[PDB]
Design a protein around this ligand. Structure first.
Ligand SMILES: [Zn+2]
Ligand SMILES: [Zn+2]
Length: 61
């Protein structure tokens, strides 16, 4: 169950639903249901998880 590093890990039949790769700074694959990806962001394939946002290192912190 380490192939998807997510606390709120919604597990279907396994290879049932559609996934998404959070590139950002982790590149870990999550099911859309697992991390609740809105179909707009999922269409854009653009889902940056909390770790990637908080370890993005902005121009002001
Ligand atoms: Zn999961
Ligand atoms: Zn990420």
């Amino acid at each position: 169950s380490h192939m998807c590093p997510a606390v709120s890990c919604l597990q279907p039949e396994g290879d049932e639903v559609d996934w998404v790769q959070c590139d950002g700074s982790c590149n870990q694959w999550f099911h859309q249901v697992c991390v609740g990806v809105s179909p707009e962001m999922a269409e854009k394939e653009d889902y940056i998880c909390v770790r990637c946002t908080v370890k993005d290192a902005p121009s002001r912190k």
